[PDB]
Amino acid sequence: MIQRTPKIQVYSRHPAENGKSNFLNCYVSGFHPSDIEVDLLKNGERIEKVEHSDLSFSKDWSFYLLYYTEFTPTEKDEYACRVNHVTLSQPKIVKWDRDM
Amino acid sequence: GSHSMRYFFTSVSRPGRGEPRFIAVGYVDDTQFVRFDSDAASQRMEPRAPWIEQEGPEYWDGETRKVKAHSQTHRVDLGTLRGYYNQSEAGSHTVQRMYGCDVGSDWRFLRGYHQYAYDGKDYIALKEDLRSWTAADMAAQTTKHKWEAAHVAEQLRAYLEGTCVEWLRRYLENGKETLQRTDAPKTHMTHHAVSDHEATLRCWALSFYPAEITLTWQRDGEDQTQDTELVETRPAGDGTFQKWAAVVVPSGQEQRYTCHVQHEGLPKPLTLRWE
Amino acid sequence: GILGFVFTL
Numbered sequence: 492m493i494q495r496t497p498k499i500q501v502y503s504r505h506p507a508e509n510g511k512s513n514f515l516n517c518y519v520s521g522f523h524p525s526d527i528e529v530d531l532l533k534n535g536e537r538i539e540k541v542e543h544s545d546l547s548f549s550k551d552w553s554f555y556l557l558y559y560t561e562f563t564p565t566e567k568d569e570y571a572c573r574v575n576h577v578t579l580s581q582p583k584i585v586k587w588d589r590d591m
Numbered sequence: 592g593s594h595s596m597r598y599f600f601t602s603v604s605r606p607g608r609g610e611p612r613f614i615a616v617g618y619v620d621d622t623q624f625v626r627f628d629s630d631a632a633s634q635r636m637e638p639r640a641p642w643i644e645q646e647g648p649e650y651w652d653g654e655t656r657k658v659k660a661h662s663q664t665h666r667v668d669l670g671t672l673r674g675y676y677n678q679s680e681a682g683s684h685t686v687q688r689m690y691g692c693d694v695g696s697d698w699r700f701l702r703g704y705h706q707y708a709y710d711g712k713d714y715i716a717l718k719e720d721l722r723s724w725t726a727a728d729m730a731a732q733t734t735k736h737k738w739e740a741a742h743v744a745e746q747l748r749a750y751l752e753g754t755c756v757e758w759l760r761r762y763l764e765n766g767k768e769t770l771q772r773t774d775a776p777k778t779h780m781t782h783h784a785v786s787d788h789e790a791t792l793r794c795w796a797l798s799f800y801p802a803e804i805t806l807t808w809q810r811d812g813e814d815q816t817q818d819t820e821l822v823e824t825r826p827a828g829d830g831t832f833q834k835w836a837a838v839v840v841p842s843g844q845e846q847r848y849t850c851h852v853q854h855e856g857l858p859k860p861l862t863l864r865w866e
Numbered sequence: 867g868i869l870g871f872v873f874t875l
Contacts, residue, residue: 492684493711504827506797518825523711524685525603544826545626545639546614547599552687552708554601557826590781590793591835598868617868650867657868664872671875690869707875714875734875743873750869758867 495553496578497522499585501531501571507564507589515562515587517572520555528582529558530573537573538562564589592773592855593701594620596759597691602665604673604684611669613662618691619762619770621802622830627658634659642766672709675730685710690747692755698763703751721748774800774831775856780865785839792865793837794850798827805853806836810844840865 497519504514515538519529525546531538543558562570575582596619603612613629615636624640631637636654638644668686678684687708693701706716715724715731715738722744726735738744763770776799783791796806802824808815820837827833840848845865852861 495711498823500822500825502825502833504829514828516825516828518823520823524683525601526683545616545623545628546601547616547618547623548601548687548689552711552713557828559828590783615868654867657870660872661868664874668875675875686875737875738873741873746871747869754867754870 493523494578495521495523497527497574497576497583499572499574499583501585501587502591503562503564503587503589504559509564509566512561512563514559515570517558517574517585518555519558519574520549521553522555522576522578523553524577525554526576527554527556528575529556531558531560532571532573532584533562534569535571592771593693593695594698594759594763594770595691595693596755596762597689597704600661600665600686600688602662602669602686604669604682606681606683611666613665615658615661619759619766621800621832622766622769624762624766625654627655627662629662640766640769642769643762672714672730675733676709686714687711690751690755692751692759694756694759698756698760700752700756703748703755705747705751717744717747721751769830772800773856774798776804776852776854778850778852778861778863780850780863782845782865788842790840790842790845791837792840792845792848792850793835794852794863796834796852796854798831798833799854799856800831801855802832803855804832804834805851806834807851807853808836808838809849809851810838810847815848 498521500518502516531541538560541558541560543556548554570587573582573584598617600615615627617625624643626639627636636658665686690705692703695701703721707714715726715734724735726732776796779795781793796804808819824832824834850863
């Protein structure tokens with residue numbers, strides 16, 4: 492049956508300024524079926540309280556979810572989004588780059 | 592400005608581990624305002640926008656009751672389509688439905704939508720005249736014959752040209768501050784040195800509402816369509832969206848490039864240049 | 867506000 496793979500974007504709500512609070516976001520889109528596991532990570536450790544929007548889909552019927560967490564960027568702390576779906580032979584890990 | 596109300600529904604079968612998952616959401620333009628989730632504690636339609644929160648208990652009980660009827664109807668459909676497609680009872684499957692309406696700047700009806708998909712492909716859709724169906728295959732044709740006989744389209748026509756438009760309008764006037772705004776994009780460019788001879792030049796659009804934007808680079812007036820890394824418009828999480836377009840510039844050529852931003856809220860399109 | 871009626875495939 493159809494299986495489309497997620498696009499992944501990891502980014503912050505606002506322009507990242509260290510010491511200032513923000514939200515780390517991970518937008519997954521263009522996928523099918525809806526079963527996906529998305530983790531936001533801080534220095535490789537899985538962030539515990541990450542919320543996500545409610546499952547919607549686009550005109551072509553593929554799904555999108557936003558995952559997000561309150562975070563204060565620091566110059567040392569690394570953040571990434573690990574994503575897993577049936578399309579991926581291994582969980583896709585995308586790192587957060589502040590200029591992206 | 593044109594506006595649209597759309598409802599999106601997903602049923603996914605959980606063979607052996609229970610009753611299917613049904614998630615309903617509702618949107619006026621790019622703002623989600625309601626949701627129902629089968630696996631949620633409450634078993635009620637819930638507000639997802641503050642402007643719908645002060646609707647009455649009448650609205651919430653009324654919307655809860657209707658979405659729960661929807662939920663039941665699609666878990667019947669998961670069985671029916673597994674029969675129509677002669678699938679095993681073991682596999683997980685997906686039905687999606689979407690319907691809604693569009694108005695013009697005048698807030699009068701433009702278009703109504705009503706369509707289903709089984710496992711990510713179009714199953715059946717009401718055609719634009721809101722009188723006929725587009726049934727994909729033989730199973731969607733069984734379904735078309737059914738809804739033809741029971742005059743489902745004439746009744747649907749009445750929701751999408753009447754009571755959908757009426758609600759959208761109401762929502763627009765009740766959620767006026769969120770719904771009738773135009774956040775114009777805050778634009779800016781960055782310059783990262785990829786090497787001694789190359790650099791990325793990224794044009795940002797941020798905090799704009801609605802989601803529609805054209806962010807486009809150019810070199811000496813020529814479209815740079817294959818040479819631009821354009822990302823998918825993304826939610827900022829606060830009800831605005833973000834987007835960037837980037838090009839790798841041969842050192843010394845930065846002046847050749849212009850980024851062009853078109854959005855509802857820009858009196859005129861922007862042409863940005865690194866300088 | 868959603869549809870007041872339902873119909874099955």
